[PDB]
Amino acid sequence: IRLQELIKAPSRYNIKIKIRQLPPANKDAKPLLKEMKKSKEFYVIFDCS
Amino acid sequence: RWKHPSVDSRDLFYINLYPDYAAISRAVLDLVLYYNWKTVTVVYEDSTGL
C-alpha cells in the first residue's frame, strides 16, 4: 500500500523491480540477506516500520 | 468469504471456508513452473489484488 505506484512503475517506464517479502519475526531476514549475497544487487529499499 | 486475518490478536473463532490465498498462489506457481514460460506478465485490478 505504500509502494503500489512503484508496482505501477513498469506499466509506463523501463524500470525493473525486485519485490521481496519479510516473514514475521526478525529471524527470517537471514535467508533473504543470503540470497542477496547470491544475487548481486546494490539498489535496495526497506519498506518497514 | 475472505476476511483480513487479525495479525495482532489471536482468535480461535475464525471459521472461514474461503480458500487460502497461499494455496491458490502456490497452485499458480506450480502450473507456471510446470509450463516453463520464462517470459510472463500479470495484470491486477488494484493493490488489494496483490
Side-chain angles (χ1 to χ4, degrees), chain B residues 1-14:
Chain B
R1 57 93 176 172
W2 185 85
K3 164 67 186 294
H4 197 294
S6 54
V7 297
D8 186 74
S9 47
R10 304 285 83 77
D11 293 330
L12 203 54
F13 303 165
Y14 292 165

Side-chain angles (χ1 to χ4, degrees), chain B residues 5-37:
Chain B
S6 54
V7 297
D8 186 74
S9 47
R10 304 285 83 77
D11 293 330
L12 203 54
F13 303 165
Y14 292 165
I15 300 95
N16 197 352
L17 202 61
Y18 180 77
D20 190 0
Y21 290 171
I24 62 170
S25 178
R26 57 191 183 92
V28 290
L29 320 183
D30 290 330
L31 67 86
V32 69
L33 65 86
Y34 182 76
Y35 289 156
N36 285 317
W37 297 306

